[PDB]
Amino acid sequence: GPLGSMQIFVKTLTGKTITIDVDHADTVGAVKAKIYDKEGIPPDQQRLIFGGKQLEDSNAMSDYNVQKESTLHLVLRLRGGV
């Protein structure tokens, strides 16, 4: 039958590769929260960057650029915290 599932790769400012399963019916905001719990970083303090440009809250699934395994750059400005 039908199906829909695709994981993404996020790279933290500390050079950490993380994998998370997501669906095209999801959004950046939701993904950010998932990663936050994955390790324990502030989603409101972290941001996504692709090729140099930042990714909005809907710039991911709806954008039609989410695949089973995509490489994205994640930069967080924690400077010391959880």
67-70: long-range contacts (C-beta < 8 A, 24 or more apart)?
Answer: 67/6, 67/8, 68/6, 68/7, 69/6, 69/7, 69/8, 69/9, 69/19, 70/8, 70/9
- For 66, counting Cβ atoms within 10 Å of its Cβ (0-12 exposed, 13-18 middle, 19+ buried), the class is buried
Sequence ranges of the domains in the chain: 1-82
**Using an 8 Å Cβ cutoff, are 24 and 66 in contact?**
yes
Determine the 3-state secondary structure of 67 from DSSP. Answer: coil
According to DSSP, residue 26 is labeled -
Q: What is the CATH number of domain 1-82?
A: 3.10.20.90
Tokens encoding 61 = 């699934």
Of 32, 65, 68, 62, whose CA–CA distance to 50 is shortest? 65
The terminus-to-terminus CA distance of the chain in angstroms comes to 43
Experimental technique, in short, is NMR
* Order of strands, sheet of 71-76, starting from the edge strand that comes earlier in the sequence: 17-22, 6-11, 71-76, 46-50, 53-54
What is the distance between the alpha carbons of residues 3 and 48, in angstroms, rounded to a whole number?
27
